[PDB]
Design an enzyme around this catalytic site. Structure first.
Site, short mmCIF file in Angstrom:
data_model
loop_
_atom_site.label_atom_id
_atom_site.label_comp_id
_atom_site.label_asym_id
_atom_site.label_seq_id
_atom_site.Cartn_x
_atom_site.Cartn_y
_atom_site.Cartn_z
CG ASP A 127 46.46 49.34 41.89
OD1 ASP A 127 47.22 49.64 41.05
OD2 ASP A 127 45.44 48.96 41.69
N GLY A 172 43.37 45.51 31.62
CA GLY A 172 43.37 44.63 30.60
C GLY A 172 42.03 43.87 30.31
CG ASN A 197 47.39 46.56 37.56
OD1 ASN A 197 48.60 46.19 37.21
ND2 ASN A 197 47.05 47.74 38.02
CG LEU A 198 44.04 39.99 35.83
CD1 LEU A 198 43.74 38.49 36.46
CD2 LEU A 198 42.74 40.49 35.40
#
Ligand SMILES: [Zn+2]
Ligand SMILES: [Zn+2]
Lengths: 340, 340
Positions: free
Chosen positions: A107, A248, A268-269
């Site tokens: 990330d 999001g 992305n989560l």
């Protein structure tokens, strides 16, 4: 190019672009799941398998450092470096048994965290010379705080180094420069102009109202990025850019649909999966109170043992089940469900 | 042989015997910590580093299957096989950063679980031909339910196969045959007689009242095993056998001292570490109630976020700290503390 759908485990090289191309052709995005342990890795791999879907596993700087343990000094990024390597080996070894294509990612990495990036690349290069593949499928650079010229130039250096291993590079561009609250298509194409001659294995995460004043989400500008690049490239490809959707959480189904229709391949989560992972372990020892307070517990007196109940294989599993349920919600929303 | 004390990570081959020989010469045992996740691995590695001590990491059949996730079918031992391999790669990668010698072990494997043993050996052999070392430092066979002749003979087959990689083999013998509630020294020496010509890299776990009627612990018979072997071998070595202590929970400091003085090098720890791992995560969300019930929570109204509190890097860490505290108690009891 649909040969990647029958691949088992972590994919590399052209297989990552083939998966993203299939995502753009079929009109779905793949969720990028932040992982911090073997338990959260398993929750993501199981959710994508049960829904017949590909998945992206990523470690942040803190998440990778957690794979090494907080007891390891991370002042020199050593915990983040060693933890991401150890997490990469674990994910490479266990993902094939789930029978799904997996993209191994890292990330956000700002300028101050570049020693972490350098350490991973070093392990990638050593593994590539041995096995012909790097450890990670892809890495992410977040020099959005730097000037657009310095951000792109530094991205150029690393992409030249990563393209030797056919490694995918994700970069983030913001509103720094060198409306004014959104990355303009010209700026996004400047990223494409500098990286495309090196290798096509790159994706762009631009600022379009995704906070991660009150700027509303502007997913329409993503389609503007693609039309501007297509006109400057001179091709019939309606989605020449691989776009990424950071932060999001809270967006509607309509905003995700328009973003995916604009060539977004990756959403992305993180936070939403962290909470889901807790609720299962939360609901366990809550509804099983006094069953864990001592090795004495209940139902009867001190005659009964609690070994069956405090077994970590039992209650941590409850956290995996609720995390996998939350990821399944994203697989349905992003249309990743039932794509393999 | 004291060169192993400065080794970093998982050790193999003669280094395992050197560590056990140093344990016998200095009079301390090493705890064998059952691990089921990256979080429990880190708790053990950190405890041994903070106490300047070597450590043994082991995965049981269920623990290895948990490293793969309960969602993986384990009817063919596939989850146990793939999980132990994935756990081995993770432990190999992250243990060097803790700067301690680590023995990578696998726990009880009965006759019915031999497909699990065969799968691990297959991965061991593939890794050995590539790198010169197997994946695991050692494996354990538990054919104590079979006849002593069949148990030893089957141990002979596998030890012949494992000695090609200089791999350590732990075996368990009980009271089956072919007082009567304890393994006799003649039976224990029969194990030595069959395995020693193959390789010296083996340890024996005999039945001596360690239940895992009411047979009391008989640690004195362990010293009888050593004197019987020494007289039959014909040497001045007072501890020719490497002995293992299974199910030591509840034993006094005196019983551990007499067992270690009889050449015990390894004491298994499982249930006590499982409970300790829970209490930290137990004490967290208990004393932080309503801070995790929603992404709304407290201190104020709905204006405050809970992301700082349900972050798994925060509360799972509490389970690692309490597990590492329990392991530190064993390191002091077994005199493993401050031996490096
Ligand atoms: Zn971002
Ligand atoms: Zn046993």
């Amino acid at each position: 190019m649909a040969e990647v759908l029958k691949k088992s485990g972590v994919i590399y090289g052209d297989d990552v672009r083939k998966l993203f191309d299939y995502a753009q052709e079929k009109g779905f995005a793949i969720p990028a799941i932040n992982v911090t342990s073997s338990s959260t890795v398993v929750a993501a791999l199981e959710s994508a398998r049960d829904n017949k879907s590909p998945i992206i596993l990523q470690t942040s700087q803190g998440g990778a450092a957690y794979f090494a343990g907080k007891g390891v000094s991370n002042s020199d990024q050593t915990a983040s470096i060693q933890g991401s390597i150890a997490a990469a080996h674990y994910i490479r070894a266990i993902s094939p048994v789930y029978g799904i294509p997996v993209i191994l990612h890292t990330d956000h990495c700002a300028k101050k965290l570049l020693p972490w990036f350098d350490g991973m690349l070093k392990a990638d290069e050593e593994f590539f010379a041995k096995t012909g593949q790097p450890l990670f499928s892809s890495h992410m650079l977040d020099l959005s705080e730097e000037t657009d010229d310095e951000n792109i130039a530094t991205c150029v250096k690393y992409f030249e180094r990563m393209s030797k291993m056919n490694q995918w590079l994700e970069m983030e561009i913001g509103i720094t420069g060198g409306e004014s609250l959104y990355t303009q298509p010209e700026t996004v194409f400047a990223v494409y102009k500098a990286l495309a001659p090196i290798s096509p294995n790159f994706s762009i995460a631009a600022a379009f109202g995704n906070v991660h004043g009150n700027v509303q989400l502007r997913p329409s500008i993503l389609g503007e990025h693609q039309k501007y690049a297509k006109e400057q490239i001179g091709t019939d490809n309606k989605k020449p850019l691989y776009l990424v959707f950071h932060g999001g959480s809270g967006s509607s189904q309509e905003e995700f649909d328009t973003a995916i229709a604009s060539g977004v391949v990756k959403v992305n989560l993180d936070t939403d999966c962290q909470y889901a992972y807790l609720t299962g372990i939360r609901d366990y020892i809550l509804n099983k109170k006094e069953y864990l307070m001592t090795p004495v517990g209940n139902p009867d007196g001190e005659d009964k043992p609690n070994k069956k109940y405090f077994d970590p294989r039992v209650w941590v599993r409850e956290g995996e089940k609720s995390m996998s349920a939350r990821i399944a919600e994203a697989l349905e929303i992003f249309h990743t469900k039932n794509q393999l």
